[PDB]
Write a protein that binds this ligand. Sequence first.
Ligand code: PCD
Ligand code: PCD
Ligand SMILES: *C(=O)CCc1ccccc1
Ligand SMILES: *C(=O)CCc1ccccc1
Ligand code: FES
Ligand code: FES
Ligand code: FES
Ligand code: FES
Ligand SMILES: [Cl-]
Ligand SMILES: [Cl-]
Ligand SMILES: [Cl-]
Ligand SMILES: [Cl-]
Ligand SMILES: [Mg+2]
Ligand SMILES: [Mg+2]
Ligand SMILES: [Mg+2]
Ligand SMILES: [Mg+2]
Ligand SMILES: [Mg+2]
Ligand SMILES: [Mg+2]
Ligand SMILES: [Mg+2]
Ligand SMILES: [Mg+2]
Lengths: 907, 907
Amino acid sequence: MIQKVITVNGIEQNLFVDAEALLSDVLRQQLGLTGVKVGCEQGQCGACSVILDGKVVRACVTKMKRVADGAQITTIEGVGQPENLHPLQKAWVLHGGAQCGFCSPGFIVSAKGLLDTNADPSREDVRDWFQKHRNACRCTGYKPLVDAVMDAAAVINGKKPETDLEFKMPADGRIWGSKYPRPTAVAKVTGTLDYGADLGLKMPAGTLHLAMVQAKVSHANIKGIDTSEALTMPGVHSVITHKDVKGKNRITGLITFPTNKGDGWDRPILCDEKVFQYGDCIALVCADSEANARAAAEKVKVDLEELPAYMSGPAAAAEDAIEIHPGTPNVYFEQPIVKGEDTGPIFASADVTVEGDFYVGRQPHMPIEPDVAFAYMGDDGKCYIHSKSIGVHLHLYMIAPGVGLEPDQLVLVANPMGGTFGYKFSPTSEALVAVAAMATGRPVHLRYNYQQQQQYTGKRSPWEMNVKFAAKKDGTLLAMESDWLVDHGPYSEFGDLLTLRGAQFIGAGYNIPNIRGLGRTVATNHVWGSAFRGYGAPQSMFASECLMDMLAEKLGMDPLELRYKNAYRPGDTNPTGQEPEVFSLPDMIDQLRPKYQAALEKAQKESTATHKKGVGISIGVYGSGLDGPDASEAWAELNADGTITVHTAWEDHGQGADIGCVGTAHEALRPMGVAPEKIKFTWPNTATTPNSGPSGGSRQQVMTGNAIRVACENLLKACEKPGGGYYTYDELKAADKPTKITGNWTASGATHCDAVTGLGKPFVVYMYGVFMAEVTVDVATGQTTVDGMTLMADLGSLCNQLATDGQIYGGLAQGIGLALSEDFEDIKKHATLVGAGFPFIKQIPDKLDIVYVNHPRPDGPFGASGVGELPLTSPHAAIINAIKSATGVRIYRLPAYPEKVLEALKA
Amino acid sequence: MIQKVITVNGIEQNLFVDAEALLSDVLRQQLGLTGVKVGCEQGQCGACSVILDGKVVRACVTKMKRVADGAQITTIEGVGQPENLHPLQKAWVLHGGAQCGFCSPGFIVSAKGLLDTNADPSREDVRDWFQKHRNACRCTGYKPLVDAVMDAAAVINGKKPETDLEFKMPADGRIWGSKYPRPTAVAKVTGTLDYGADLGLKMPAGTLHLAMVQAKVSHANIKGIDTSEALTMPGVHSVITHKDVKGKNRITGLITFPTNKGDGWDRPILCDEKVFQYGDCIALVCADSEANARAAAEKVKVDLEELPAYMSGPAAAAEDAIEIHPGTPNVYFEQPIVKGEDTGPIFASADVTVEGDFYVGRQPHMPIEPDVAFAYMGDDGKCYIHSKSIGVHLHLYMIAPGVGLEPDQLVLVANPMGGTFGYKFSPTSEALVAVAAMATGRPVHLRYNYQQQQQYTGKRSPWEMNVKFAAKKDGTLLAMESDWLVDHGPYSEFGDLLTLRGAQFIGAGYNIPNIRGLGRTVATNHVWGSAFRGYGAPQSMFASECLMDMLAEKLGMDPLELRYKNAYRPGDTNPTGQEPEVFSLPDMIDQLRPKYQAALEKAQKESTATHKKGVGISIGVYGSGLDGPDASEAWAELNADGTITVHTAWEDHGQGADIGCVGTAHEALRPMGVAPEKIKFTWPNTATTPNSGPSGGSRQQVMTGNAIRVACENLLKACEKPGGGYYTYDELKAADKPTKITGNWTASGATHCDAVTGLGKPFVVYMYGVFMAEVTVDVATGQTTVDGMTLMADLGSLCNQLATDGQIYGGLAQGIGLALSEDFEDIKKHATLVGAGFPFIKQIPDKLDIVYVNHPRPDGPFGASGVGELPLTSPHAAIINAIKSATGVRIYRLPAYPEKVLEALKA
Ligand code: PCD
Ligand code: PCD
Ligand SMILES: *C(=O)CCc1ccccc1
Ligand SMILES: *C(=O)CCc1ccccc1
Ligand code: FES
Ligand code: FES
Ligand code: FES
Ligand code: FES
Ligand SMILES: [Cl-]
Ligand SMILES: [Cl-]
Ligand SMILES: [Cl-]
Ligand SMILES: [Cl-]
Ligand SMILES: [Mg+2]
Ligand SMILES: [Mg+2]
Ligand SMILES: [Mg+2]
Ligand SMILES: [Mg+2]
Ligand SMILES: [Mg+2]
Ligand SMILES: [Mg+2]
Ligand SMILES: [Mg+2]
Ligand SMILES: [Mg+2]
């Protein structure tokens, strides 16, 4: 051990450390500076950035031997605190740079290092700095972060007053539609919002820390588990196996479709008889520390009989393949789509037909924060779970039978969380921590490392697709045929529903009167499927939007004009036979057209012999809602102090559940003159918040926003005075009148798509958009650079423009990754951010352009649709269409890795 | 477990706690708020004061079940921080209220609670508030704390500007003699100075926490130790016994006198063959936490044969008493004093003689911070110990042979510490933690609780005394006889030296030409003797100063005038035959006389039938130095940045080693114009600071101040330019000239007192003072209230008046405790602050008056003497003399408990 006397955030510390200890651990654990966030633990994400002697360093890869006596360290806590915010922190708040907020401390500390060396950076200087310091963000698309740095620099330089970093009220009021900052921003930018790992460090000494004993093969029969050596290791309390599970030891898919051939009870909590994928949790070591738990988990011996594994959909779907779940065929679900007339004769007599085979793969979510959860037995006898769940009520019912609790004896709570992008539509760690809390009686905490985040959380499910169009010479679509095979890994939850998305969204955007297609879901031994932002649309619309460009090419038609010819107009129906609710695609195309023509001219002018530029288009469509007559509930409560709490279970991935609640309630409460800072939101809790439903399907603004609107309207009625005006809290309580008022809303007149035909009215609100990608391909290497993205977006009405702009930039960036670099195919090589192709800042252009073309929705609150998934519906189709424009090469199977593009260029 | 969402220092915390957990532990351990200090752990000291929902509560006795959802908590960290200080914090700094600083956070938080309920308190309101909230201080005597509250209130109330709480430079400069604040004050008042327990919470996860297995009888032969059950308990690593000690397993007294009958190797590190006192450490449990170590220590079984214990000096000294240390007589040392002519004939022919039997007991130091230390093996192979040692070099040599290390392989460092008052002149925990670090190879940390602080640290040693005076009718002293028996408990360290203090200080202050006396040191089984502020003078001068009043009464003379007749004047010698170096007692008496006469008149006027007032006087004298030609060393270093570091091992109990260094160096450096904020001090470290010696014997200002002065003079010479002026660092380094310059100083011409006669010149500088106590005795109950204390003090020249005023107030308060309430006689009943008679604020009068009558010392730096022990030399004699004045009752055996006084009143 060594004594080191240094200065941390301006104060002398007398530190006692191991010279080999990591600075991140010393700062977080020894000094309590949980504003130093840790994600990857491998020097690749920048979340743990600190200033050490004037240099920005990643604390997770800096050992204490590199910290000299007398060193100066600055963490986010030393940059500024609430009510003493630094200009960078104020700028972040104003520009909406904290979505999940997990990267915000590291970017802000890194940016302070930049400005202390270059006071007046260009935007490109800022981008270069964040690239060099590996500051990674999965939520924002980086542009808001650069905007904030530039604004802060101007203030620090004396070019504008610091008061200009504070939000100016629009002064009619109306925060609806404004850039009002989100309530959680201050905590995020100061490192004072405790995420699950932070909470673990602040739990009491009795708390047991867990480590998973995981399968290191993809498929096996389990013969036994020997925990004897592990039990003798330092700090070890016990080892938990399936024998300690008090219920069925299975997670239920809960809404497994009747036509599914499986019963939905396929997924174990702790593997008993079989390993189904690499990473499956077979046992839990409980110890005094994460480090001691992990060391002991390495010594647990699992006796296995390895079985041949099916590592893709086509392999598992073969007629003679062995059943992974004995008694259920590997192909466990099929969804037909049958619209209009038989397509064979129409293809036979059509002027033009096209066909293609396409593939979209196993995209990894890659939040900066790896999965984490904890549980404990309450003094009330209930089991409490605090996790990254984005559907607390949903997950309660998915796990309760398996862990052996009645629903009233379990409580699920959503912690603040550093992004999910859908992986948390699935249970991950909740049942594991519940089992351990119940077995030990003690609080338990489980943190995944980044390799476990990659290998052992769910993934976008690969689709192998064939799609065909028949059309007239003038470009009018006549018919479509479609076939898709969905590789869902071994666990069925929501896989049939995902497959149904192909019936809804292959070919969406256009009038197609005659459709014949079939989707199939197959179990495999690769990673299980969890929702990923877009949930079936990124697959579906990659196929159809690429095929639209192929049709345009075969007709000799411009691809934007082909879309204009066919885009939804009154009288048309979507693939499930439903009329669209608004008709904004022609408007959006007309407004994009001159910008597309200018982009084509620029690409021609600026291309060189080696660096070929191109422009690509696509349309995106997605529902806002879960299928059928979805619903939500909210409670609007006048508090004694005159504030109003709007109680919901609107789960915050980081997208803005806080600001969505506040902005929607503010608008509904305007007749009573309620200031926005007087409106409070509630963190999701199954015991004390209503069943607002999960934050999936781009649904909360519509469903929960309408429930909030109705609850607030009902509170206004409850407060209205005879003769005009409103009663105060004191006046209502004096009269023994209610102050906590319910509202509900249902999407009545949605219907679930039929099991035989695929027809129905699954959503009452959709999101519509038109993408344009501008790219350069180096034809010597096959490397593509995306130089610009544009989204024309119809969101109906904006609740909050900082929220919606940020959602769109973040989705566009994930689209660039999906198009060019991302996959989870190689279990080890793709288990790091860099290995799996995470988009660092230079891969995302600074030119991300939005044009809102909002057509108010009949059923949305104040006319709003959702936004969350719109920007990931088809940006990757626009990018691949742009590579084709540039070079003549079409990539059919994502991603467009440089060698793949180069092979195609040279063929 | 329960979730509680509350606000701490203005920020929402999402807390996860056990409902039975203590708020102090949650705040310190879970949230890292080590500004919440914990001392007693029993609700008696206020150090852990926090504001909870507007009320000041002791966090150590507040369970989490009492903290409601939505509660508001404020700790010192929420009051203010460095560079954002609250008016209370600024006022504390300005008024010198942080000496050790351990109570400062709790007083400041408590004071904020006061001012939030009563904005304009009277001084008595402030005192009432601190009494009710149990805010305890052992260093300051409370008056500076009240001064700070009043000044802060005036600012908060708008009556004076906040800038008036900032020190104003005297503007000739000269910080010598000023009220310049001490360097450590800001850290102390913000809770950002880490004391040993704080450091333990900030040590790494590998650190083992120790608990002592202690004797629960006073005297025994040990037959065996069974650790088997303890080893099976949660978190236990190992149990350490004497078998794990690698050296002699004895602490050496190091300077045991040749005429001592013992060899000085009597004290074990870990008991092997015998228990010598209740509390002796027999084994150390090493575990993952203090709580788990303590639980397991309860299960270690020690097989003992209890022996009869000698629990007082007279019992152990009996001719037939059994030897506690077989082979050494219990009475192991005698010191005669033989000055002038045989006293028997002089007593026989004297006009007047008096005699008395007196007792001063086992006073407990009662710092607010209980003992704590840690150790580790460095990467350099050395064993490092960080403790409350106030003599790091001394303790290194006392423990090295016992732990089995050569002196160059051990390093001792003084942590910031919350007071000692002398108990840390002894080793306590240093050898224990060294043994454990060496045996395990791991860092180890040992915290005593308050009962262990009381039972198992050393004590003031009781003296049984007989003293006699012979005098002329005019009051001239002719002769003195003295006998004293010193109960030193079982461990000999410095007991012979303490006994020699009786030869030096019984009768000090007066010319006494003829003296015959004998001191004896005896080993007992009560607590071992460690220095307590005054070290022999409180015993010695209680006897002689009470006997002076008895002589005055027998002569019919005023007791101040009797002292005036006999006080040192040129030509006189002290009891060891040495001439005083200055002659300030007549001056001080002449300046006190009218205030004494006015106090007598007030006492007569304000007395009632039941509440009798009185006034008492005493003189105090003590050396500044350790006996003989004491010495020190300092290094003065010009740093690259133009600051100057003054390297010393001046150990800071809290008295002001920091400001003593800075103020002394500033004065010495004036020719070069060095600003005080450019002068740095060094924490004591045996490897990297010079052997300045221990902070005992009121010596550092004289010895180390002179060494600092000389080092700084030498640095000036090293910097002097030819032709005038001074070279800069850069100029010196360019010339390859030295920048780190040594200075040494020795008290040459001191001599050690002779072993046969007691004669010698042991110190070259003494401290001189005259006390006046004003008291009221309730004759119905025997309760005494001290209404005022005055000290006339000759300190030569003041280095810093905030430091010296505070030293005097603190010593006067300890004198009130010694006189009226304090002891450590009952091993269990006296093991709490309240049980042992700790003086809370109402027991210390607000009227504490100092008059400096400074006579510059020939050998002191800039004329200074010490101060530390002067105010505890005889205040308790003045108080008992005042009880006698008031009531006619003399208490001979301290303390003056109410029942004891009442028995005497009614006899
Ligand atoms: N018009 C409009 C719309 C909307 N908004 C906003 O925006 C947001 C969003 O919304 P929405 O759309 O409704 O959604 P939500 O439900 O809330 O959420 C969810 C989503 O969200 C997104 N985004 C995001 N972001 C972030 N940051 N992070 C994340 O993680 C995420 N994730 C993703 C996903 S995947 Mo799934 O579960 O697969 O189905 S679905 C999803 C919010 O805040 C709101 O409020 C506005 O403002 N306006
Ligand atoms: N003239 C003069 C003198 C002095 N000063 C100051 O004052 C202080 C003190 O000093 P001195 O006297 O020199 O002393 P020191 O050595 O440093 O110290 C020690 C002491 O100190 C005291 N005080 C105190 N305080 C406090 N707060 N705390 C404590 O704990 C204590 N302890 C106590 C004791 S006990 Mo022995 O160890 O028994 O012998 S001794 C003793 C310092 O700060 C200094 O600097 C000044 O200013 N001036
Ligand atoms: C979609 O064809 C069927 C959806 C469903 C119906 C009943 C229960 C579960 C899921
Ligand atoms: C005082 O009479 C003797 C002091 C002494 C001399 C030598 C070594 C130790 C102590
Ligand atoms: S770079 Fe340190 S946690 Fe990712
Ligand atoms: S806000 Fe950057 S990772 Fe979420
Ligand atoms: S009153 Fe709490 S530590 Fe003393
Ligand atoms: S300053 Fe109050 S206990 Fe030391
Ligand atoms: Cl391809
Ligand atoms: Cl490649
Ligand atoms: Cl008595
Ligand atoms: Cl009593
Ligand atoms: Mg500022
Ligand atoms: Mg038509
Ligand atoms: Mg590959
Ligand atoms: Mg190749
Ligand atoms: Mg202020
Ligand atoms: Mg004379
Ligand atoms: Mg008694
Ligand atoms: Mg009695």
